[PDB]
Amino acid sequence: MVATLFIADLHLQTEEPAITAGFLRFLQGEARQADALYILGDLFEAWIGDDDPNPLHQQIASAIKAVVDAGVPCYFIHGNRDFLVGQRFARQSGMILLAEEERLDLYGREVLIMHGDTLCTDDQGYLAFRAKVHTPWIQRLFLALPLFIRHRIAARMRADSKAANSSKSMEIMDVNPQAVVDAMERHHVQWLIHGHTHRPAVHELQANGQPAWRVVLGAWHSEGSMVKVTPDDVELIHFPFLE
């Protein structure tokens, strides 16, 4: 089919087997026919390095690679949960790693894609955390630690994140509308697709002196979510995990 697909915020983990089964079934569906599949971050609930022997990682890598081998190029933009996904997993899965912002030409429509966390520019605490965990020497230090140490550090970060999210106001954590305009005018696009916020919606705004739209993907909780771009339209689609 002449369509390009976008998903994000699956937060896969061995403790949520139903979501994993829904993703595996999705990879065997119309996704096998798409022009391309873009995964905009937070594919996994957490990532502590490509050397993690977590069997779910190889199961997911195998299923994506079968999609790639079937002729569907697959791309990945990092999320706040899996920014440590590296070239070893890209090779294992056949995915191509992209930068934090990418501008696509989709059947004549220019579209900006990103995970979306960098649009929450009022959360100065988060952005300070993000700058640190993206520093290469700090990443290399974390990756040199034993796996059982990395698990403990990840567990503490998750605990403190859930605490800070409960003590922070939604008005300081949500997407900043001026950061959206700035990003869409930096790339001169009228269309933007992102995830992270788990609030699937289509927001109309103004950018480049024209109407513009910000499409938000949904997290995979009870059902799946995807954006489908065709030469004719942009579709936000919700579907069950199983038939």
Ligand X SMILES: CCCCCCCCCCC[C@@H](O)CC(=O)N[C@H]1[C@@H](OP(=O)(O)O)O[C@H](CO)[C@@H](O)[C@@H]1OC(=O)C[C@H](O)CCCCCCCCCCC
Distances (CA, A) of 36 to 2, 72, 194, 220, 230: 9, 5, 16, 20, 11
Q: What is the CA radius of gyration of the chain?
A: 18
* Contact criterion met (CB below 8 Å) for 120 and 176: yes
Counting contacts by CB under 5 A, is residue 196 touching Mn ion? yes
Give 124 or 208: the residue with its C-beta nearer to ligand X: 124
Q: Express the helix, strand and coil content of the chain in percent, nearest 5 each.
A: 40, 25, 40
Confirm whether residue 81 is marked as ligand binding: yes
Indicate which single residue of 14, 70, 149, 156 sits in contact with ligand X (rule: CB under 6 A).
156
Give 171: exposed, middle or buried? Use CB within 10 Å, 0-12, 13-18, 19+: exposed
User: And the tokens for 181?
Assistant: 């305009």
Confirm whether residue 165 is marked as ligand binding: yes
Confirm whether residue 122 is marked as ligand binding: no
Counting contacts by CB under 5 A, is residue 204 touching Ca ion? no
Q: How far is the CB of 192 from ligand X (least distance, A)?
A: 17
Segment 72-101, which members bind ligand X (CB under 6 A)?
A: 80-81, 84
Q: Enumerate binding residues for ligand X (CB under 6 A).
A: 46-48, 80-81, 84, 117, 120, 123, 125-126, 129, 133, 138-139, 142, 153-154, 156-158, 160-162, 164-165, 168, 173
Binding site for Ca ion (CB under 5 A): 171, 174
